[PDB]
Structures are given as C-alpha cells and as structure tokens.
C-alpha cells in the first residue's frame, strides 16, 4: 500500500 | 493541497 | 480500496 | 486526509 | 473484508 | 492484511 | 504525511 | 512541499 | 510484514 | 519499502 | 522525514 | 530539502 501528498 | 492512498 | 481528495 | 485497509 | 474512508 | 492513511 | 503496512 | 511512500 | 512514513 | 520528500 | 522497515 | 530512502 502507499500515498502521495502535496501542499 | 492534496493527498491519495491505497491499499 | 483507496482515496483521493483535493482543496 | 484518507484510509483504507482490509484483511 | 475491508474499508476506505476520505474526508 | 495491510493499511494505508494520508492526511 | 502518510504511512502503510501489511502482515 | 510533498511526501511519497509505500510498502 | 513492513511499514513506511513520511512526513 | 521506502518514501521520498521535498520542501 | 521517512522511516521504512520489514522482517 | 528532501529526503528519500528505503528497505
């Protein structure tokens, strides 16, 4: 499993 | 901003 | 599953 | 934000 | 089973 | 069985 | 941020 | 900035 | 079983 | 398993 | 920062 | 700066 963030 | 995941 | 969201 | 998870 | 949730 | 979360 | 595991 | 990740 | 964060 | 980040 | 690990 | 890595 995994994510990605951006701000 | 934004974020995504999975599993 | 999974998700996803943006603002 | 977001989660997912199973078994 | 499982479950995703995205707020 | 497994998880993933962002935020 | 995120995270994610599995067993 | 961002972050990235997975298992 | 493993893990990954990022923050 | 791994992540990469970036500010 | 990151962390990662599996056995 | 930025950090990346994993196992």
């Known amino acids: ?3 990605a ?3």
């Open 1 to 3: 499993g995994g994510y």
């Open 5 to 7: 963030g951006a701000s």
